[PDB]
Paper text:
Using a pair of evolutionarily related DNA-binding proteins, each with a different DNA preference ([name] [Partitioning Protein B] and Noc [Nucleoid Occlusion Factor], which both play roles in bacterial chromosome maintenance), we show that specificity is encoded by a set of four residues at the protein-DNA interface. Like [name], Noc has a three-domain architecture: an N-terminal domain for protein-protein interactions and for targeting Noc to the cell membrane, a central DNA-binding domain (DBD), and a C-terminal dimerization domain (Wu and Errington, 2004; Wu et al., 2009). The NBS site differs from the parS site by only 2 bases (positions 1 and 6), but Noc and [name] recognize and bind them with exquisite specificity. We show that specificity to parS or NBS is encoded by a small set of four residues at the protein-DNA interface and that mutations in these residues are enough to reprogram DNA-binding specificity.
As the first step in identifying specificity residues, we solved a 2.4-Å resolution co-crystal structure of the DBD of Caulobacter crescentus [name] bound to a 20-bp parS DNA duplex. In the crystallographic asymmetric unit, two very similar [name] DBD monomers (root-mean-square deviation [RMSD] = 0.1 Å) bind in a 2-fold symmetric fashion to a full-size parS DNA duplex. This structure reveals several regions of each DBD that contact parS. First, the recognition helix α4 of the helix-turn-helix motif inserts into the major grooves of the palindromic parS site. Second, helices α6 and α8 contribute residues to the protein-DNA interface. Last, several lysine and arginine residues in the loop spanning residues 236–254 contact the minor groove side of parS in an adjacent complex in the crystal. We found that most of the crucial residues for binding to parS are within the 162–234 region, suggesting their importance in recognizing DNA specifically. First, R173 in [name] hydrogen bonds with parS guanine 1, but the shorter side chain of a corresponding Q158 in Noc is unable to bond with guanine 1. G201 from [name] has no side chain and hence cannot contact thymine −6 specifically.
Numbering used by the authors:
A (entry chain A): 125 to 237, 243 to 250
B (entry chain B): 125 to 264
Amino acid sequence: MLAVLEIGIIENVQRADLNVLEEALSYKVLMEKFERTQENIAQTIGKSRSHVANTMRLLALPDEVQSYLVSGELTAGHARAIAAAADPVALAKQIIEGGLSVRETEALARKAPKSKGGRPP
Amino acid sequence: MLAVLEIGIIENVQRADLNVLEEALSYKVLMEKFERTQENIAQTIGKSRSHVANTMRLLALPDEVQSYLVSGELTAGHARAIAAAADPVALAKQIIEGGLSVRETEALARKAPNLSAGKSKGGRPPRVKDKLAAALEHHH
DNA sequence: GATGTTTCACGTGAAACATC
DNA sequence: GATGTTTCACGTGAAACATC
């Protein structure tokens, strides 16, 4: 089987009519099956390693936030900015309610976020 | 003939694999033949009227600059920023040599205006000197 | 070396002017 | 009303950090 097949498939992920989350799952599945690094994918598609990483990180977002991405109520920039936040769904609602830019959203994330319990001695 | 045909063709200009100049000529040709305004195209493709105008304005650039756009040595932002300049080809060379951002390119364009079309038209010099004209020689 | 994450420079597209 | 042009806000993608 010709090696060029893998390269063409990876190349055409970004050239196809895929939303950001469809591109993410594509890269993840291809990295796994063809056993390729974030760095290898990046060099293949002519992008940065962090771009590949940040794209796939979006798959970890709660389904409510992913729904906003698909519907276009949030952009990829908004979603990524709240990805490592305590309550991304709360922040998502604030972004849509307030009409926040990605820059304003980054500011919100900076200025926002538990006891494991056990019998008291 | 169904009217929806024109709309689909206009819609798919931006969805096709066209460089900025191919998109420009498409819009121009379609505006002409279907007798539609910049405003009508804009509303059809879900963009601004100025976006449609600025896109087509790029067709007026010298062939040398258009070549840089096609080759990717310049972006649409660079090309548009020098479109109303006296010598766009000179500016194009400076942008590529210096690796100037579009913001830096806009700054260059401000401080080298096309308003240098105040060139002397010539003409036989009159018998009576014309004092004011003679005095504007030094300052110019 | 591989990957997680944040901050900001960039070109693109639009607002804010202009003329005719 | 239609169109020419300039300036700048925006999201995207990358640099500059981090851990393991």
